[PDB]
Amino acid sequence: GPPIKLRVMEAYPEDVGKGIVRMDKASRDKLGVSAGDLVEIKGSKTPIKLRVMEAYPEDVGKGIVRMDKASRDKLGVSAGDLVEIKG
Numbered sequence: 001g002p003p004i005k006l007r008v009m010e011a012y013p014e015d016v017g018k019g020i021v022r023m024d025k026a027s028r029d030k031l032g033v034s035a036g037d038l039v040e041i042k043g044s045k046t047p048i049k050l051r052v053m054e055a056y057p058e059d060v061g062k063g064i065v066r067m068d069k070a071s072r073d074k075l076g077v078s079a080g081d082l083v084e085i086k087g
């Protein structure tokens, strides 16, 4: 559906090495996606796809997505950057 911009932040250690993105309900609902769906994320390198998982309560309403450093490096983005996401 429509793309949205979200601030990428580092995965909690619990989630390092899972090909996932933690996204909150407002973000998922704007994108039209569910947990388990793949989303495409754009950065300075070529885009990647990650699997949506429900945000942690600590992060709800903050406009962020969490993904691990391997994902950010593959995207050519840093923690704190805005990234474009699309379902």
Ligand SMILES: [Cl-]
Binding pocket: 018, 020, 053
């Ligand atoms: Cl998982």
Ligand SMILES: [Cl-]
Binding pocket: 023, 024, 025, 026, 054, 055, 056, 060
């Ligand atoms: Cl959520």
Ligand SMILES: [Cl-]
Binding pocket: 073
């Ligand atoms: Cl590189």
